[PDB]
Structures are given as C-alpha cells and as structure tokens.
C-alpha cells in the first residue's frame, strides 16, 4: 500500500488497484525494468493502444482485469516482446485479433469472464484450445450468445494457403533465381516476403502481385546458401508462412592452421564449397594413411553456413610425422589445397 494508484511489489513488480495505472506507470523511474505488472479497476481503459505499454521491455507477467477493456490494438504488445503470461480476464472483450499475441511465447493466455463473440476472427483461439496452448482448455471459453468455443463451427475459417515455386536444381554463382509465391484464401489483407539478412548475397527484385508474388534474386553469391526465403500472407483468421532455401554451387576452398598439442595433437582446418568437398591428406606429397592414431575428425556442422571445420588428430606422433601436411579439398569445380609444416617431436 502506497499513496499512488500503482505500488511496487517485490523486486521488479508493480500492482495498480485504482484508476490511473498507465499514468502512474509512465512516471515511475525504472519502469523499464519491471518484470510483472498487475492492473485492475481502470475506468478509462476501453482501448489498449501501442503506446500504453511503451518501454516495458522486461515484462514477463501482465495482468489487466476488471477494467472494462474492450479493444486491444493488434500492436498493443509490440513493446512487451518478452511477455509470457498474459491475463485479460473479466473485461468487456468481445473479440481479440490473432495479431495481438503473434510472436509472443505465451505460456498463459487468460480470457475468462469476457463476452467473447465467436467468428472467424476467433478461430486462432479455438486452435490454441485444440492444441492445448496457453492454458486455454482449462478455461472452457464460451461464445457469448452461442455454445462453447470448442464447438464453434469453422468450415469457412482459414488462414491463407501458400505455394512457393522454387528451382528444383542448384544454381551457379552469378545466376538469377526466380521464385514465386501463390496465395489463396478469403479476405486476404497482405502478403509479401521476409528475406533474413541476405548480406547482399543477391540483388532483390520483387514483381507482380496477388495472387502470384514474384521474386528474382539476381547475381547470386555463394552466401545465398542457408538463407531463409519466406513467403507470408495474412487475413482476419491468421497468418501463413513458407520458408525455402536456394542452393548455390561454388568451388572448394581450404585453409590450415598451426598444429596445437592437446591430449591429441590437432592440425585444424576449415573447408568450404558446395557440393561439400571430399578431403584427402598428403604427407610430403604422398597420400597419408589414416589410422587409429592419425585421422580426420570434423566439428559438428552449422545450419546457417556451409563451411566445415575440423582437425587432423595425431595421437602420440613422433619425429617420423614431422613434415609437410597438405589438405586436398575437391568438388565438381576442381581441387583446392593448403599446406603447412608441422613438427611434433625432436629428432633422436
């Protein structure tokens, strides 16, 4: 208890029991560090707008109850991206857009005691109930003038359906790649592409429009590999996405590093190219015979890149293993090579 509408609670919480929570919240030094916010009995909270939760980046638990909340802006939680428990029960909400919680990792979404009006705009919540999400099944939510949400008819409700047309085959560095995204569904609002930071691995030219969006990736580089190319579309029911990748073939490359002694020795290497190159060690120009004690071992590959790393491992090498280690790396483009001198034990 404190002489403000909002009183701090715990290390990083705020509990607001009288009107004026939002004003009080935004006059609180350090409010950006709040991790829990409880709000009740507001008298002028018909709408929750984008700016109302501005700056509350650390918020994990948000409760707004008994406040006559009627309209939640689709971007009302843009400034609360870490929200994981959201309780909006006992308001006047007749509808709730799927956009409000999109992108949140909500463990809990509480909508009890609201006069929910069922329509295709509530199909997403029905899916959460179907899939056991957000603690929604236990609420047994109801369509206010009808029956339970679990029985809302839904034959006409659907997110857009997408088909992405991609090249079947790999391409070469410098090629132009055409992709297309075909979108179907009722009441389409928007569609487009999300291109995760290409880093200029392609020149991006969009063309056409609904229902067949066109994408040309021109003058591709090898770094277009592993990049997610996503087509998305949205209507009142929900959002659909399809992500694809393009394969850009490119020549082998190899590099060696100075030998380092650990419980085994390691000659570290990195290799790149696509198709992934085959590897062959030579020692003083002769093929090296890999054995139980001298063998190639790779680090686990990474999903976001084609380069591979590893070691030539040597368990207890002697002076006979002093000399010139060459790593050959070859794919359909030809053979690359790198060489390094290595010494392991003094001559007797």
């Amino acid at each position: 208890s404190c002489p403000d509408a909002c009183c701090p609670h715990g290390s990083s919480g705020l509990r607001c029991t009288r009107d004026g929570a939002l004003d009080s919240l935004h006059h609180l030094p350090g409010a950006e560090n709040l991790t829990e916010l409880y709000i009740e009995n507001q008298q002028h909270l018909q709408h929750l707008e984008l700016r109302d939760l501005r700056g509350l980046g650390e918020l994990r638990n948000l409760t707004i109850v008994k406040s006559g909340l009627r309209f939640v802006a689709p971007d009302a939680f843009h400034f609360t991206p870490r929200l994981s428990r959201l309780n909006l029960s006992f308001n006047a909400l007749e509808s709730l857009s799927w956009k409000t919680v999109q992108g949140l990792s909500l463990q809990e979404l509480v909508l009890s005691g609201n006069p929910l009006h069922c329509s295709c705009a509530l199909r997403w919540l029905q899916r959460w109930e179907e899939e056991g999400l957000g603690g929604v099944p236990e609420q047994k939510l109801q369509c206010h003038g009808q029956g339970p949400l679990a029985h809302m008819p839904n034959a006409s409700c659907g997110v857009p359906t997408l088909k992405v047309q991609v090249p079947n085959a790999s391409v070469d560095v410098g090629d132009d790649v055409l992709l297309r995204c075909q979108v179907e569904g009722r009441g389409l609002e928007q569609a487009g592409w999300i291109l995760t930071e290409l880093e200029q691995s392609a020149t991006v030219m969009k063309s056409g429009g609904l229902p067949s969006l066109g994408l040309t990736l021109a003058n591709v580089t090898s770094d277009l590999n592993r990049k997610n190319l996503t087509c998305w579309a949205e209507n009142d029911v929900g959002r659909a996405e399809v992500s694809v990748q393009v394969n850009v073939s490119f020549p082998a490359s190899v590099q060696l590093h100075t030998a380092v002694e650990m419980h085994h020795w390691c000659i570290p290497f990195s290799v790149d190219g696509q198709p992934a190159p085959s590897l062959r060690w030579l020692f003083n120009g002769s093929v090296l015979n890999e054995t139980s004690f001298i063998f190639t071992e790779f680090l686990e590959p990474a999903a976001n890149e084609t380069v591979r790393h590893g070691c030539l491992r040597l368990n207890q090498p002697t002076h006979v293993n002093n000399g010139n280690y060459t790593l050959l790396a070859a794919n359909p483009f030809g053979q690359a090579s790198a060489s390094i001198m290595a010494a392991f034990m003094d001559n007797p």
């Binding site: 590093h257 380092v260 650990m262 085994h264 570290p268 290497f269 680090l299 790393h309 070691c311």
Partner: peptide, 16 residues
C-alpha cells in the same frame, strides 16, 4: 571433459 576442451580450442582457432 577433455573432448569438450579440445573442441572449444579448435573452434576458437578456426573461428577466431
């Protein structure tokens, strides 16, 4: 543990 130290050192070498 030795293999985990081994892999961390190789990663530092090859990634810088």
């Amino acid at each position: 543990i030795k293999e985990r130290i081994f892999k961390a050192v190789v990663r530092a070498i090859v990634t810088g």
